[PDB]
Amino acid sequence: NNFYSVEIGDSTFTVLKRYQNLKPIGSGAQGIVCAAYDAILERNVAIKKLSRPFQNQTHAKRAYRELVLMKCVNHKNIIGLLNVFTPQKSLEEFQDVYIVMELMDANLCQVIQMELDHERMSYLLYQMLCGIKHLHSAGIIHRDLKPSNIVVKSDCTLKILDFGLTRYYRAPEVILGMGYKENVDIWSVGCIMGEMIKGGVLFPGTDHIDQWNKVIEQLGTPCPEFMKKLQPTVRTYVENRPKYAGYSFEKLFPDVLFPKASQARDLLSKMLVIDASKRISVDEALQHPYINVWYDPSEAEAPPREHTIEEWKELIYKEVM
């Protein structure tokens, strides 16, 4: 009676009366998302109905992780929570979790291929990095940034859609089975940037092995010191490819491609480094002359197991409440 129902395909959305004009815009394994107008905040929102949160402990933990990290994490460059709710009135009746977020206009897939000027390119990248830096401060390393999970509005603002864990934006650490650290995210930012400057996917591997070869064909075969860090099985393969020299970044990104171009190149040459121990950090990328132009300390320096289904249910119910 605070709630009403709309049918979205085979699924029923029961939502607060403030949320009108529901139109489905997403449907994965994680859940159905509708766009919607919020009549109280007088703006557009995205409403996500969680796919079977208590079906099992895999779903239960992921839903818990989503709920808590969205509550606590708070930054203009990260999709934040506007609201959460359930239409059910008691722990016993509890079934469905609705998360409400700001509605963004687009993802980066189609935008990045339209040649942006430096100002916009650098500003978008400055934004991503402030978002990543904030995620990293909360102990969240994403591992899976790509055009599809970075969202923008027509006012050139930008947010990171989700909290992570198309293999084209995966770091070599992830592609092989090596450990990773914070700067695993720098790689994904490196691919995205290169793409902006070039106009198409940097490393379009047709499979989890061709991804490697695409990378080395352009960047050169990594050091034998890097090879020693690999698992035996992957090292026997990788170590026995033909040796690639790679091209210098001047060749990989010549003045010809750009709308400053020298600065963007130096940065790229520091992000797309295969060996992560030699790859630039988030903080060093924020201080880079190509990115530093926008620096604002309020943006680039802000502040930060075992259960059964019935326990998870409660834990989630309380978080809704």
């Binding site: 687009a106 916009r120 500003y123 923008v152 509005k153 027509s154 050139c156």
Partner: peptide, 9 residues
């Protein structure tokens, strides 16, 4: 430098 305030979708 002025922060861009438009983006073409």
């Amino acid at each position: 430098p002025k922060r861009p305030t438009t983006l073409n979708l």
